[PDB]
UniProtKB/Swiss-Prot annotation, chain A:
Binding site for phosphate: G151, V152, G153, K154, T155
Subunit structure, as described in the record: Homotrimer. Component of the ATP synthase complex composed at least of ATP5F1A/subunit alpha, ATP5F1B/subunit beta, ATP5MC1/subunit c (homooctomer), MT-ATP6/subunit a, MT-ATP8/subunit 8, ATP5ME/subunit e, ATP5MF/subunit f, ATP5MG/subunit g, ATP5MK/subunit k, ATP5MJ/subunit j, ATP5F1C/subunit gamma, ATP5F1D/subunit delta, ATP5F1E/subunit epsilon, ATP5PF/subunit F6, ATP5PB/subunit b, ATP5PD/subunit d, ATP5PO/subunit OSCP.
Highest taxon, organism lineage: Eukaryota
Catalytic activity: ATP + H2O + 4 H(+)(in) = ADP + phosphate + 5 H(+)(out)
Native source species: Bos taurus (Bovine)
Function noted in UniProt: Catalytic subunit beta, of the mitochondrial membrane ATP synthase complex (F(1)F(0) ATP synthase or Complex V) that produces ATP from ADP in the presence of a proton gradient across the membrane which is generated by electron transport complexes of the respiratory chain. ATP synthase complex consist of a soluble F(1) head domain - the catalytic core - and a membrane F(1) domain - the membrane proton channel. These two domains are linked by a central stalk rotating inside the F(1) region and a stationary peripheral stalk.
Family: Belongs to the ATPase alpha/beta chains family.
The protein's name: ATP synthase F(1) complex catalytic subunit beta, mitochondrial
Binding, Mg(2+) 1: T155
Curated annotation (Swiss-Prot), chain B:
GO biological process: proton motive force-driven mitochondrial ATP synthesis
Gene name, Swiss-Prot/TrEMBL: ATP5PO
Protein name, per record: ATP synthase peripheral stalk subunit OSCP, mitochondrial
PTM summary: Acetylation at Lys-139 decreases ATP production. Deacetylated by SIRT3.
Species: Bos taurus (Bovine)
Its biological purpose: Subunit OSCP, of the mitochondrial membrane ATP synthase complex (F(1)F(0) ATP synthase or Complex V) that produces ATP from ADP in the presence of a proton gradient across the membrane which is generated by electron transport complexes of the respiratory chain. ATP synthase complex consist of a soluble F(1) head domain - the catalytic core - and a membrane F(1) domain - the membrane proton channel. These two domains are linked by a central stalk rotating inside the F(1) region and a stationary peripheral stalk.
From Swiss-Prot, chain C:
SUPFAM superfamilies named in the record: C-terminal domain of alpha and beta subunits of F1 ATP synthase, N-terminal domain of alpha and beta subunits of F1 ATP synthase, P-loop containing nucleoside triphosphate hydrolases
Gene designation per UniProt: ATP5F1A
Organism annotation: Bos taurus
Protein name per UniProt: ATP synthase F(1) complex subunit alpha, mitochondrial
Transmembrane segments: none
Tissues expressing this chain: Heart muscle (at protein level). Heart and liver.
Length: 466, 167, 480, 509
């Protein structure tokens, strides 16, 4: 159908569609639009008017314009040729290596498997980060929510994980830079290309890049998310390939959504937060999992709006989590990389079963130690400290040491750190703590544990201190 | 802009916003009444199910309706502004409003020229007079009935409460 | 043409169909759309019908004909949902094809009468000592499971459910509790595991799982409990005891608010609409412990609330709080410590829990509860050091991790031991160890006794002497 | 309806069939004007984002193309406008005149040289409607840019193309800092440092003219003004104007970048803008969200800021380097707009009053001062000493942490403090302190090799000046060399050192 722009009030483009309309979601191409300015019908605003969303720039647009419904929602290239491609929301290589000639296009609304249709079971993958494995072990399909500060090394950490994993794990990847920092994509690009994770010698990689940068219209930023989402299901089911889905940042997705909701002259709930906040997510999150045909494992960055987590958005987020790594800024600030919170850098899916029962127990003990230890912090904070009792003091230290030991150097940020990163075998970790649990590092000080890999090296490090 | 002819009755907004258009329009050229009456006429040319059935019904969803009642029905002799202002209200949905617009108008040569006193004793018969307290006694030859609708009952009311009012 | 029972989709927000027409529709009618979707003509506006769309569209495009179904909603209700995962329409997302439930009953039916109702006197148990002990609990009862995330929370429900296995699979007619797990906004995965889990655990045969997963459209997710509720009454009123676990209403509320807002039917405190206490209230008031007319039956409500940072002052929690007959408050630190139970005991509450449970437990528990208080309290004295010793012993004793439910008698037994300080003559780690061994010991031997204790409904003094002796023998005799 | 258009001059003719007016599509009649939002009736074919012109010579921009009217943001004040008024399109959206004949100007953001030259207007205009470059268009920030502020240049050493937050409180020398840089850029710009042909763009958001006036005067004084646009949206302003200013600058600077040149924008500050804009939104009714701010204040900025970059080759490789400013209030960072900015900015510069009270102007929280960018923003010269120094300071600070039970606990730490303190003396800088790298490294060198660590803290500074005058005088050779080798070369070091030791000897004695 063709519609006329009756209102562009911002990028809420109200088009009254005039050869009828198709249903909602159907993607419209604005006629007279320079590039393909797809408007996605979002609402039948009624009266054969739709409220639509422009995802392009609207500047300079003569209103009253004519939009021709593309007659369906947006479809975007699918097939392996997308790995090693930076696609924008609308497919369109922002790899700009010329086209991604794919055989499949897909409308970005992909769906969720019914109960029966999804592998109803979990796995245990691991990560090689002490802190992680120990507290939040891994699995596949699992969406992990990662909190904290990009480039504290939050963002870096993600990469590092990718760095070992995509390579190591075959099962493809999606990287979704939602409101991506373009620059960060660039550098990274030269790096990826370089890295051979991205292969350009072969259009594919092991990984497809989706960048939906900040400068895009929110609709675009919001929607780039579904796009990527669509892809991974393609890879899973179609390609087998077990995507690791990097989302940076689902909050930035969200933001684009909320902002949108507002403009959608809806009621975007408390804090302005979109009414649909949840539904957007639910519908989305369920489009992620270990189906029978594979797993789309999500590594979900969630940067924290106004840095609060009691914030509904993270509240929502939680509902879909499988593991969560909540970085602690306090910890990060304490000059600890990893930046972890040791209280919700979690997996429910750590169980004596899922990990070693020991692993788990050791962890529970640890989790305990920290948990108790925190309790002391307040007291200590007020009151100086020393008369609590020494065993506790020991735990305290141990905890700190543990803290320091959780601080695990990183090679990718060796550049900064001078610290040679360490990805740590599971045992060393388990042991690490066990040893610490055995409290052996008597004499040995706190900083002897800072930024090491396997626990010996810390012991060693005390020695290096000496 | 064009200074506006706001002779009340009218209603001041409320298709006084409309009315006043024609309180300047009709008014200029003094088709005031000419049109005042166009409307009257029109009204019932409406009030049969032209009115329900498509007229105030869109089920077609007014979009073609307003582009066919601009021309199948707005197709008339009532048209120096009359159909055109219709053709303005139409899209602008104020078709559902029309009695009142007319009302507003019609209260103009018909009743601008009215009457109104209403004490508790009165409740005027509103007859069309530009002057007052005259007609207002002719009323007593009018006076010959009612439940004291136009002008009042002053019985339950005045008086009836009074005994109460003392206690 | 009906624009008085049928409508043309005037506008459709994307889930609120403003539908021109429909009039003759009765308020709160299920309608059916020309997108095949269902709707409820919820809002009878003087012009159009706000029809909450019970579906997902891009099927709807305006003008779509909205058809009456001509019905105010009922849901299939029955007793055959036991062994079934369903969705609220009464379709069964289990993919066990369709259910056996078949009678239908308005979810819109309300709260039992006082006389129809009959106060709790009827125990309720979980196989979780702490719960059964420290909450003295009956059936009919609302008790809030309140906590943030399965942190065993969800586990908690499971262990209970699993616990019912011995009873439902026992011939405990009275402890034949139909479990209704309304899974509200839960990932499918979670459910998957869960489903699996329960299935593996097979409580599921005597269990409804109403599953409204994370994706699921909001009114549906919202609806599911009411649905569940109708179904549970189905047992209740039918003598039987259903347990509905409303899991979780936080998510329901959200959805619901959202729903409201989309109806542009206002928010309220925390942007949440005004009836929302009421929401649940009416719902939960429909839960009851009945009189005899209803076969004495019950619908025990274990509603669940997921707090956000344990914040309950929170209007909706407060709401809920003011309704419930107590709460099971869970505290992280202990969980995190590994202490499962993790509870904040103080915050877990039964206003008057004890009037619908069991002497056996009671006999040891009252006093114990107190000792723990004392033990807890004091933030050395031989006494206090003792309380601590005990307390810690008892901690282990109430510590049954996730995946640990039980027959009661086992529980009372071990509790007894602890209350005799028998355990204080042991290193705390070995309490646990001991306990395991011990348990298999009495299981082995004094299954006799346990059978009896279970029999007496109380602990007999006699049994106590045998038990004491048993315990002591095991104790002493495996004290190392 | 909207009683507007029920204006019975409006209505009063559609009725009649006596209509035909302004254009009501390319011109409009102001339906109402109030609120700087000129609901202007008509405007249909109206370009989006279009700059229109009012029958007041005031400009407006067609924000909401509503089917009836345009919510038009007013580029003036509506005491200077009234109802009905005809707004005629300018047809076009905003571009701002862009070029180069702005370097040496204080203009209003409307490109009218409020300085008093009047517009030395650019022939060209360049879209403010212009957007950020792509991934591929960029090739990494590596080009340093050093402020002549030792601390900065070292520890959060500065690249180019960048976007780094200047954050700090009520003229905590903040501006002072900006000046020392500006003056500093002078030498490069007095170089024909084409890599560092850094055209400075000072976006003044909200500064009352007098504040600008000293400042500009300062720029004039720094004569740095010559390569400088001062985009000026003072306190006296309509809000959009302040709002607009960055964007304006944004068109302009990307041009340099893309013409290989190096542009520097100082947005001072988006805090005010955000407020203004939010407000503007809010005034537009147009949402708030968190902290009452519309959510797309992020978009606004994000979009704004992606437009600063360090380009690839296509663009002459150039830069538009952004030094955005946010003035903190009590380091408020979950302060949404800060939150945002942090995630955008590629490190951030914390300023601290205490340090300021300590006299330490510059007042930096180093620990937090971060260049997420880090290593790319440097020069080896600096890298070689600063690497160690930064680190040494890290420790020093850690141990400034741990300095109060006696710090004579271990030697190191006492030392770290002594040493640290020495360096501290060095890193405080006067006001109007642009600097040359070789001195800076020189001075650093002295300390990191502890020579100054063998000196009383008071005299460190004393040395520093002296040392500078000394090296300036004699070892001009060497200064030439460090610049030449671009680094501290080992030789230069040996001479330098040798100098240091002697100089030091001369300084101390």
């Amino acid at each position: 159908t063709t519609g006329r722009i009756v209102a562009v009030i911002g990028a809420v483009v109200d088009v009254q569609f005039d050869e009828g309309l198709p249903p909602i979601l159907n993607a419209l191409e604005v006629q007279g639009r320079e590039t393909r300015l797809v408007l996605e019908v979002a609402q039948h605003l009624g009266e054969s008017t739709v409220r639509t969303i422009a995802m392009d720039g609207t500047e300079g647009l003569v209103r009253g314009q004519k939009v021709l419904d593309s007659g369906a929602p947006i479809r975007i290239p699918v097939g392996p040729e997308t790995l090693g491609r930076i696609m924008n929301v609308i497919g369109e290589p922002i790899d700009e290596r010329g086209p991604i000639k794919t055989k499949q296009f897909a409308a970005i609304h992909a769906e969720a498997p019914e109960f029966v249709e999804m592998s109803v079971e979990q796995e245990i993958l691991v990560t090689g980060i002490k802190v992680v494995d120990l507290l939040a072990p891994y699995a596949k399909g699992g969406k992990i929510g990662l909190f904290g500060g990009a480039g504290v090394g939050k963002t870096v950490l993600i990469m590092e994980l990718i760095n070992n994993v995509a390579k190591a794990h075959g099962g493809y990847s999606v990287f979704a830079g939602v409101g991506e920092r373009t620059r960060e994509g660039n550098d990274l690009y030269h790096e990826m290309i370089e890295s051979g994770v991205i292969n350009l010698k072969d259009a594919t990689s092991k990984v497809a890049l989706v960048y939906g940068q900040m400068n895009e219209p929110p609709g675009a930023r919001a929607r780039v998310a579904l796009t990527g989402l669509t892809v991974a299901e393609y890879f899973r089911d179609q390609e087998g390939q077990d995507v690791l889905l990097f989302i940076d940042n689902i909050f930035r997705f969200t933001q684009a959504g909320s902002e949108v909701s507002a403009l959608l002259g809806r009621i975007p709930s408390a804090v302005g937060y979109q009414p649909t906040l949840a539904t957007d997510m639910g519908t989305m999150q369920e489009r992620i999992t270990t189906t029978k045909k594979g797993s789309i494992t999500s590594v979900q960055a969630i940067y924290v709006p106004a840095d609060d987590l009691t914030d509904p958005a993270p509240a929502t987020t939680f509902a879909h989590l499988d593991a969560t790594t909540v970085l602690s800024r306090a910890i990060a600030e304490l000059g600890i990389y990893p930046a972890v919170d040791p209280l919700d850098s979690t997996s429910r899916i750590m169980d004596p079963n899922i990990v070693g029962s020991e692993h788990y127990d050791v962890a529970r003990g640890v989790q305990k130690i920290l948990q108790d230890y925190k309790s002391l912090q307040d007291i200590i904070a007020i009151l100086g400290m020393d008369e609590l009792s020494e065993e506790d003091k020991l735990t305290v230290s141990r905890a700190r040491k543990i803290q320091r030991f959780l601080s695990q150097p990183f090679q990718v940020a060796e550049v900064f750190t001078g610290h040679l990163g360490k990805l740590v075998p599971l045992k060393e970790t388990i042991k690490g703590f066990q040893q610490i649990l055995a409290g052996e590092y008597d004499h040995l000080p706190e900083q002897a544990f800072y930024m090491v890999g396997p626990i010996e090296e810390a012991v060693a490090k005390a020695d290096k201190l000496a | 802009f064009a200074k506006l002819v706001r002779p009340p009755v009218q209603i001041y907004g409320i298709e006084g916003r409309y009315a006043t258009a024609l309180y300047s329009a009709a008014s200029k050229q003094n088709k005031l009444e000419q049109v005042e009456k166009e409307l009257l006429r029109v009204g019932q040319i409406l009030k049969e199910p032209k009115m329900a059935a498509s007229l105030l019904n869109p089920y077609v969803k007014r979009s073609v309706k307003v582009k066919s009642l601009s021309d199948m029905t707005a197709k008339e002799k009532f048209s120096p502004l009359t159909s055109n202002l219709i053709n303005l209200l139409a899209e602008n949905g104020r078709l559902t409003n029309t009695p009142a617009v007319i009302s507003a108008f019609s209260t103009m040569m018909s009743v601008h020229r009215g009457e109104v006193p209403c004490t508790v004793t009165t409740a005027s018969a509103l007859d069309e007079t530009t002057l007052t307290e005259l007609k207002t006694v002719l009323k007593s030859f009018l006076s010959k009935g009612q439940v004291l609708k136009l002008e009042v009952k002053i019985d339950p009311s005045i008086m009836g409460g009074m005994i109460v009012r003392i206690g | 043409v009906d624009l008085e029972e049928t409508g043309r989709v005037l506008s459709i927000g994307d889930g609120i169909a403003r539908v021109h027409g429909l009039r003759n529709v009765q308020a709160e009618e299920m309608v059916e759309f020309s997108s095949g979707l269902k709707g409820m003509s919820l809002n009878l506006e003087p012009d159009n019908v706000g029809v909450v769309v019970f579906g997902n569209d891009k099927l709807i495009k305006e003008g779509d004909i909205v058809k009456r179904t001509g019905a105010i909603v009922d849901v299939p209700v029955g007793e055959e949902l036991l062994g079934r995962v369903v969705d609220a329409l009464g379709n069964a997302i289990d993919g066990k094809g369709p259910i056996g439930s078949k009678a239908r009953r308005r979810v819109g039916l309300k709260a039992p009468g006082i006389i129809p109702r009959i106060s709790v006197r009827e125990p309720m148990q979980t196989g979780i000592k702490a719960v059964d002990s420290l909450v003295p609990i009956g059936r009919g009862q609302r008790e809030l499971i309140i906590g943030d995330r399965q942190t065993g929370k969800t586990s908690i429900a499971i262990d209970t459910i699993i616990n019912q296995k011995r009873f439902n699979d026992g011939t405990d007619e009275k402890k034949k509790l139909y479990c209704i797990y309304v899974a509200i906004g839960q990932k499918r995965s979670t459910v998957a595991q869960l489903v699996k889990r329960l299935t593996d655990a097979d409580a599921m045969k005597y269990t409804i799982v109403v599953s409204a997963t994370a994706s699921d459209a909001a009114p549906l997710q919202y609806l599911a409990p009411y649905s569940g509720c109708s179904m549970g009454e189905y047992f209740r009123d039918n003598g039987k005891h259903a347990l509905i676990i409303y899991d979780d209403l936080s998510k329901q509320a959200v959805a619901y608010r959202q729903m409201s807002l989309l109806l542009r039917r206002p928010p309220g405190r925390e942007a949440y609409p005004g009836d929302v206490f009421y929401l649940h209230s009416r719902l939960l008031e429909r839960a009851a412990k009945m009189n005899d007319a209803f076969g004495g039956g019950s619908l025990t409500a274990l509603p669940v609330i997921e707090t956000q940072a344990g914040d309950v002052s929170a209007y909706i929690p407060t709401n809920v709080i003011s309704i419930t007959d107590g709460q099971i408050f869970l505290e992280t630190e202990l969980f995190y410590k590994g202490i499962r139970p993790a509870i904040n005991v103080g915050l877990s509450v039964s206003r008057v829990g004890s009037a619908a449970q069991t002497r056996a437990m009671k006999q040891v528990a009252g006093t114990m509860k107190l000792e723990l208080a004392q033990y807890r309290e004091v933030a050395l004295d031989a006494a206090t050091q003792q309380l601590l010793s005990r307390g810690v012993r008892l901690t282990e004793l109430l510590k049954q991790g996730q995946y640990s439910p039980m027959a009661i008698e086992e529980q009372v037994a071990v509790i007894y031991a602890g209350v005799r300080g028998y355990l204080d003559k042991l290193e705390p780690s070995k309490i646990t160890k001991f306990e395991n061994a011990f348990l298999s010991h009495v299981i082995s031997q004094h299954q006799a006794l346990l059978g009896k204790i279970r029999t007496d409904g109380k602990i007999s003094e006699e049994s106590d002497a045998k038990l004491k002796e048993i315990v002591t023998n095991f104790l002493a005799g495996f004290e190392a």
